[PDB]
Scaffold this active site. Structure first.
Site, PDB file in Angstrom:
ATOM      1  N   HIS A  79      77.202 -64.277  11.323  1.00  0.00           N
ATOM      2  CA  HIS A  79      77.436 -63.500  10.115  1.00  0.00           C
ATOM      3  C   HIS A  79      77.957 -64.433   9.031  1.00  0.00           C
ATOM      4  O   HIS A  79      78.521 -65.493   9.314  1.00  0.00           O
ATOM      5  CB  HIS A  79      78.402 -62.331  10.355  1.00  0.00           C
ATOM      6  CG  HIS A  79      79.812 -62.744  10.643  1.00  0.00           C
ATOM      7  ND1 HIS A  79      80.262 -63.021  11.916  1.00  0.00           N
ATOM      8  CD2 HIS A  79      80.881 -62.894   9.826  1.00  0.00           C
ATOM      9  CE1 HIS A  79      81.544 -63.338  11.869  1.00  0.00           C
ATOM     10  NE2 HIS A  79      81.943 -63.270  10.611  1.00  0.00           N
ATOM     11  N   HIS A 119      80.382 -65.173   6.876  1.00  0.00           N
ATOM     12  CA  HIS A 119      81.769 -65.272   6.448  1.00  0.00           C
ATOM     13  C   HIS A 119      82.165 -66.739   6.335  1.00  0.00           C
ATOM     14  O   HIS A 119      81.506 -67.627   6.883  1.00  0.00           O
ATOM     15  CB  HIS A 119      82.706 -64.538   7.413  1.00  0.00           C
ATOM     16  CG  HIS A 119      82.867 -63.079   7.109  1.00  0.00           C
ATOM     17  ND1 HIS A 119      83.442 -62.193   7.994  1.00  0.00           N
ATOM     18  CD2 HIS A 119      82.537 -62.355   6.013  1.00  0.00           C
ATOM     19  CE1 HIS A 119      83.453 -60.985   7.460  1.00  0.00           C
ATOM     20  NE2 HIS A 119      82.911 -61.056   6.258  1.00  0.00           N
ATOM     21  N   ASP A 152      84.471 -68.545   7.583  1.00  0.00           N
ATOM     22  CA  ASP A 152      84.823 -69.265   8.800  1.00  0.00           C
ATOM     23  C   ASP A 152      83.634 -69.483   9.728  1.00  0.00           C
ATOM     24  O   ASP A 152      83.818 -69.992  10.838  1.00  0.00           O
ATOM     25  CB  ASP A 152      85.937 -68.529   9.548  1.00  0.00           C
ATOM     26  CG  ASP A 152      85.510 -67.159  10.024  1.00  0.00           C
ATOM     27  OD1 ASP A 152      84.779 -66.473   9.280  1.00  0.00           O
ATOM     28  OD2 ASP A 152      85.903 -66.770  11.143  1.00  0.00           O
ATOM     29  N   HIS A 153      82.427 -69.112   9.307  1.00  0.00           N
ATOM     30  CA  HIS A 153      81.238 -69.364  10.117  1.00  0.00           C
ATOM     31  C   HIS A 153      80.043 -69.880   9.325  1.00  0.00           C
ATOM     32  O   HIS A 153      79.237 -70.625   9.891  1.00  0.00           O
ATOM     33  CB  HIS A 153      80.830 -68.091  10.873  1.00  0.00           C
ATOM     34  CG  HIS A 153      81.943 -67.484  11.670  1.00  0.00           C
ATOM     35  ND1 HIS A 153      82.456 -68.075  12.804  1.00  0.00           N
ATOM     36  CD2 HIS A 153      82.647 -66.341  11.491  1.00  0.00           C
ATOM     37  CE1 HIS A 153      83.427 -67.322  13.291  1.00  0.00           C
ATOM     38  NE2 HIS A 153      83.562 -66.263  12.513  1.00  0.00           N
ATOM     39  N   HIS A 166      80.733 -55.958  12.212  1.00  0.00           N
ATOM     40  CA  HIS A 166      81.646 -56.868  11.528  1.00  0.00           C
ATOM     41  C   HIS A 166      81.168 -57.147  10.109  1.00  0.00           C
ATOM     42  O   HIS A 166      81.966 -57.156   9.163  1.00  0.00           O
ATOM     43  CB  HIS A 166      81.775 -58.166  12.323  1.00  0.00           C
ATOM     44  CG  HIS A 166      82.956 -58.996  11.934  1.00  0.00           C
ATOM     45  ND1 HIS A 166      84.253 -58.611  12.196  1.00  0.00           N
ATOM     46  CD2 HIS A 166      83.039 -60.191  11.303  1.00  0.00           C
ATOM     47  CE1 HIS A 166      85.084 -59.532  11.744  1.00  0.00           C
ATOM     48  NE2 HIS A 166      84.373 -60.502  11.197  1.00  0.00           N
ATOM     49  N   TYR A 222      89.939 -53.200   9.120  1.00  0.00           N
ATOM     50  CA  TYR A 222      88.942 -52.379   8.451  1.00  0.00           C
ATOM     51  C   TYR A 222      89.373 -50.918   8.439  1.00  0.00           C
ATOM     52  O   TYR A 222      90.041 -50.436   9.358  1.00  0.00           O
ATOM     53  CB  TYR A 222      87.583 -52.483   9.149  1.00  0.00           C
ATOM     54  CG  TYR A 222      86.876 -53.820   9.060  1.00  0.00           C
ATOM     55  CD1 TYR A 222      87.466 -54.917   8.445  1.00  0.00           C
ATOM     56  CD2 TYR A 222      85.601 -53.975   9.590  1.00  0.00           C
ATOM     57  CE1 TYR A 222      86.806 -56.132   8.372  1.00  0.00           C
ATOM     58  CE2 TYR A 222      84.937 -55.179   9.521  1.00  0.00           C
ATOM     59  CZ  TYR A 222      85.540 -56.254   8.912  1.00  0.00           C
ATOM     60  OH  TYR A 222      84.870 -57.454   8.846  1.00  0.00           O
ATOM     61  N   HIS A 242      83.800 -67.046  17.708  1.00  0.00           N
ATOM     62  CA  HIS A 242      85.122 -67.468  18.135  1.00  0.00           C
ATOM     63  C   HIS A 242      85.124 -67.581  19.649  1.00  0.00           C
ATOM     64  O   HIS A 242      84.890 -66.571  20.333  1.00  0.00           O
ATOM     65  CB  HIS A 242      86.182 -66.479  17.667  1.00  0.00           C
ATOM     66  CG  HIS A 242      86.288 -66.369  16.177  1.00  0.00           C
ATOM     67  ND1 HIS A 242      86.953 -67.300  15.407  1.00  0.00           N
ATOM     68  CD2 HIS A 242      85.810 -65.441  15.314  1.00  0.00           C
ATOM     69  CE1 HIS A 242      86.882 -66.949  14.135  1.00  0.00           C
ATOM     70  NE2 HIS A 242      86.194 -65.825  14.051  1.00  0.00           N
TER      71      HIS A 242
HETATM   72  C1  LIG Z   1      87.193 -63.840   7.569  1.00  0.00           C
HETATM   73  O1  LIG Z   1      87.599 -64.435   8.806  1.00  0.00           O
HETATM   74  C2  LIG Z   1      88.177 -63.556   9.731  1.00  0.00           C
HETATM   75  N1  LIG Z   1      89.356 -62.967   9.140  1.00  0.00           N
HETATM   76  C3  LIG Z   1      90.430 -63.695   8.802  1.00  0.00           C
HETATM   77  O2  LIG Z   1      90.468 -64.906   8.977  1.00  0.00           O
HETATM   78  C4  LIG Z   1      91.599 -62.922   8.181  1.00  0.00           C
HETATM   79  C5  LIG Z   1      91.165 -62.291   6.865  1.00  0.00           C
HETATM   80  C6  LIG Z   1      92.119 -61.823   9.125  1.00  0.00           C
HETATM   81  O3  LIG Z   1      91.289 -61.032   9.608  1.00  0.00           O
HETATM   82  O4  LIG Z   1      93.341 -61.790   9.361  1.00  0.00           O
HETATM   83  C7  LIG Z   1      87.148 -62.608  10.351  1.00  0.00           C
HETATM   84  O5  LIG Z   1      86.463 -61.703   9.943  1.00  0.00           O
HETATM   85  N2  LIG Z   1      87.344 -63.131  11.604  1.00  0.00           N
HETATM   86  C8  LIG Z   1      87.270 -62.636  12.895  1.00  0.00           C
HETATM   87  C9  LIG Z   1      85.948 -62.395  13.615  1.00  0.00           C
HETATM   88  O6  LIG Z   1      86.001 -61.941  14.743  1.00  0.00           O
HETATM   89  O7  LIG Z   1      84.934 -62.684  13.007  1.00  0.00           O
HETATM   90  C10 LIG Z   1      88.501 -62.416  13.402  1.00  0.00           C
HETATM   91  C11 LIG Z   1      88.794 -61.887  14.782  1.00  0.00           C
HETATM   92  C12 LIG Z   1      89.674 -62.751  12.511  1.00  0.00           C
HETATM   93  O8  LIG Z   1      89.491 -64.027  11.878  1.00  0.00           O
HETATM   94  C13 LIG Z   1      88.274 -64.187  11.162  1.00  0.00           C
HETATM   95 ZN   LIG Z   2      83.998 -62.609  10.061  1.00  0.00          ZN
HETATM   96 ZN   LIG Z   3      85.338 -65.000  12.043  1.00  0.00          ZN
END
Ligand SMILES: CO[C@@]1(NC(=O)[C@@H](C)C(=O)O)C(=O)N2C(C(=O)O)=C(C)CO[C@@H]21
Ligand SMILES: [Zn+2]
Ligand SMILES: [Zn+2]
Ligand SMILES: CO[C@@]1(NC(=O)[C@@H](C)C(=O)O)C(=O)N2C(C(=O)O)=C(C)CO[C@@H]21
Ligand SMILES: CO[C@@]1(NC(=O)[C@@H](C)C(=O)O)C(=O)N2C(C(=O)O)=C(C)CO[C@@H]21
Ligand SMILES: CO[C@@]1(NC(=O)[C@@H](C)C(=O)O)C(=O)N2C(C(=O)O)=C(C)CO[C@@H]21
Ligand SMILES: [Zn+2]
Ligand SMILES: [Zn+2]
Ligand SMILES: [Zn+2]
Ligand SMILES: [Zn+2]
Ligand SMILES: [Zn+2]
Ligand SMILES: [Zn+2]
Lengths: 264, 264, 264, 264
Positions: free
Chosen positions: D82, D84, D86-87, D158, D189, D223
């Site tokens: 997805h 975001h 972090d990916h 997600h 959410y 993750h």
């Molecule tokens: C945008 O990145 C995430 N959110 C955050 O880093 C902060 C904003 C937070 O949720 O506290 C997001 O979505 N992730 C996931 C995932 O499972 O994808 C988990 C489990 C939490 O970490 C990253």
């Molecule tokens: Zn995410």
């Molecule tokens: Zn994530």
């Protein structure tokens, strides 16, 4: 009394006549049609394609690239003179089937992104499939692929993003400076007082001087007739080819005559 | 033996026959042609346009909007059934001349962004000027303009982003639930085993059930003949109009017959 | 030894100090902050906003527009000096909440489309939410809203798409020529031999002359200190404001000194 | 009382801890960090990268690809779970420096095109440099690179464009079915009655069943902790890894508990 039907972009049959790859230098090839230039530059790290012609030429381009030992995944970069349907037509289809990238300036990129629609002079009459540019290049920027440097020279006029490309190749060891200069024509344009292009005449004048000062031993144009090329007579195609000075000087004579006739 | 020329998108003359604004409800109007639906919803805070028809209909749409006392700067939002040339054609030209925004889902947005090119079934045969979507809407999302709520109902099939819009209007005070359901046809599609659309049959089946359960007292379609509308007989245009159940049930009968014939 | 964390774009607290709408002419207002210019031009057919400031200023802008009797749906057009985070930040959020359009040249459009990322000098350090331009404007093009003509004057340098806007307003009937000239600074840029901007010095020189010849009775800049404005002293904000000649001449003195120090 | 400064996206230090390429199968490698998965699939005709991690990981990814004998011009395709930060953070930088293409569905493409801005839950808090998708893929579509088939499985939740990728690799000749399933979490959410995502709960439920029925002998997640991977203990990283059934069943238990607590 219904509305008029859509009209297709039809060109002369010589623009769509396929031809075998005609060699220009040790690494440069003409793989387009008889009246449309599509240059292939083969390097050690991949191939570079300049222009593509009409939108229905993507298959013929891949056929000629296959003849030169160039796989689809070996096309690395697509460069463009200007983003009109008769020169950047198959860019969208070539990107899907080759994994290549497109480098163009901002003006060519935005015109290419809307498929040539909303043209400053043609409107929506000459529409082709849209494509996005992957790298935005500036005036005088150098693009290097496989040890060959491609320098961009902005020459606005025919389109705001018209670009001439210069690179140095060899011809049996001896170096040759090649200048792929864009079109300097203006078919049916309103030259003076155009609300969509207020500084059109001033851009053309600066582009004439830009073409004259291009480092060039051999000149090519998107339409081969503009520089007196004749792809039909293969070995003697570059017989009566014009210089950079003769090409820009001849284009400006037609521009002043057209500009003067428009004032009448 | 030159390459084939480009072919234009030609439609029946009845698709391009202009018509005066035909009223559907207290705020809903048909301002398209006889065989192409283009709905105008007049609210207190502006106008909403659903679809636009062929690309050469932008002028006729602005003419009818002028007849309804709607200035170009009064068009606030453009909604779409699906992004094909015969329904989202003039969207690009209408955005430049009205200051309106476009709301569509992600699938309709990406297809609209490339002007309908690289279609899953039609390829580049049906190309129209590209336009960008300003607001991405999800399934079941509500869009409110001037106190009128437009609920989106995803019904993929004809295109991946096919969307039915439902809103409640009045007819001399009495409320009427209007459902503008997208096309449920599949002209010449490969239904089974399509590499570009692996889950095409399953999307169509879920869309049939989505149309049946639409809150609807009056049904309209992008092509008026699909729901047995006849814009020519103005006051009696909605005479023999189908229900939501009758429209989805009739479309599925043709889908199963077409699916069965494809297996033969 | 983990990788470094992301660093946010932090500015001086005076750049984020909200202020009440300060009047500049009969139709022009400053509704930004004390050290960031955001101009509102109220016309009979809607409002025009030039720049917006930092990305976290969209709410303050809508607050001041509400104070001037301008509803969100009354903002028609957003014009920009250059597409950096401290001047085009809230453009994306303002488009979603106002129904306005954005007019900018090709260079500003492509930079705005990628949210200021991949900057020629700053890289990805100054990133803001992306937004798309609805109308591409050329050099010298006139944009008319509510009877007020906005002429674009290209002045590349700080960014390739830097643009000065000139329009004529009144001050109790008497006309005043306003020139909103972009920044002529170059903080930490490599001026000579930049591979990303080969003709940077030549663009700056032509921009200095472009600013000097601007039709101007009152000059404003994206950063008010650049033209010796002081939004804090409301009625006397335009006390010691520079002319167009004094602003361009002062900027070139710093450019030559910076260029000479870079050669050392 | 000035406006608040911009806040950067900060993550745990374990998300940014570089690691050497850990082998997963004969052609699959983990080249991300200890707590962020970035998969490299080496084929005979090029490399395929799934996800990239944080935006500041592009250099580390190119370093590990160099360690595996993969030149930048050998990366052919970038696939995403997805979009975001972090990916899909370094996707923009990796496209400029590798000549690769991006294949994603329409929902991931539009989110990636605006750099993750205007998120349905996070707003503009998690913004990364924007990038464009070159190929739009549908549910169940197969992407082939170097004789390895990548099948897309839509699992919205997600993000609307969340996608699980399945491909068959070998482990010393014996085939292994690998399923790279996206995240099934929902941190903070609003699950019920979300105006931006009206059918969020129904999408999650269908995604739980989609993950259970995935052809899988070895499961990986964006993750690694979500599927009980531990990249730190290299050879024993896949020791206590969950099945597809155990991963989806564990995610749904947390979803129902979170959904029930939200109703209170
Ligand atoms: C945008 O990145 C995430 N959110 C955050 O880093 C902060 C904003 C937070 O949720 O506290 C997001 O979505 N992730 C996931 C995932 O499972 O994808 C988990 C489990 C939490 O970490 C990253
Ligand atoms: Zn995410
Ligand atoms: Zn994530
Ligand atoms: C859009 O393609 C062109 N125009 C047309 O085909 C029609 C519309 C026409 O001008 O009659 C265009 O520009 N070309 C050039 C050029 O020099 O680039 C010349 C000389 C004329 O042909 C092509
Ligand atoms: C692209 O426009 C359409 N197709 C064509 O015009 C040609 C290509 C054709 O199908 O023969 C298309 O889809 N329509 C629909 C619809 O129901 O939407 C029907 C029933 C057929 O007409 C239009
Ligand atoms: C991106 O925003 C700017 N740069 C910075 O904030 C940092 C990165 C910095 O330069 O130290 C930028 O350009 N501005 C201008 C301008 O004149 O436009 C000046 C004078 C300096 O401030 C802003
Ligand atoms: Zn042309
Ligand atoms: Zn041409
Ligand atoms: Zn259709
Ligand atoms: Zn149709
Ligand atoms: Zn700046
Ligand atoms: Zn600035």
């Amino acid at each position: 009394a219904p509305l008029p039907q859509l009209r297709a972009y039809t060109v002369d049959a010589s623009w769509l006549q396929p031809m075998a790859p005609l060699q220009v230098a040790d690494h440069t090839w003409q793989i387009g049609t008889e009246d449309l230039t599509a240059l292939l530059v083969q390097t050690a790290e991949g191939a570079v394609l300049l222009d593509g012609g009409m939108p229905q030429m993507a298959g013929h381009l891949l056929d000629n690239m296959k003849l030169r030992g160039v796989a689809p995944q070996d096309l690395r970069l697509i460069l463009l003179s200007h983003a009109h349907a008769d020169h950047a037509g198959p860019v969208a289809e070539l990107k899907r089937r080759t994994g290549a990238h497109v480098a163009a300036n901002a003006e060519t990129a935005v015109l290419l992104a809307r498929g040539g629609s909303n043209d400053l002079h043609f409107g929506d009459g000459i529409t082709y499939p849209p494509a996005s540019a992957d790298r935005i290049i500036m005036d005088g920027e150098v693009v290097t692929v496989g040890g060959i440097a491609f320098t961009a020279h902005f020459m606005p006029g025919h389109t705001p993003g018209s670009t001439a490309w210069t690179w140095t190749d060899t011809r049996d060891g001896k170096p040759v400076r090649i200048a792929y200069a864009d079109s300097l024509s203006a078919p049916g344009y309103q030259l003076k007082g155009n609300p969509r292009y207020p500084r059109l005449i001033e851009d053309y004048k600066r582009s004439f001087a830009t073409v004259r000062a291009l480092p060039c031993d051999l000149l090519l144009t998107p339409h081969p007739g503009a520089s007196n090329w004749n792809y039909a007579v293969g070995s003697k195609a570059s017989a009566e080819a014009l210089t950079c000075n003769a090409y820009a000087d001849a284009a400006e004579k037609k521009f002043d005559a057209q500009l003067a006739r428009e004032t009448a």
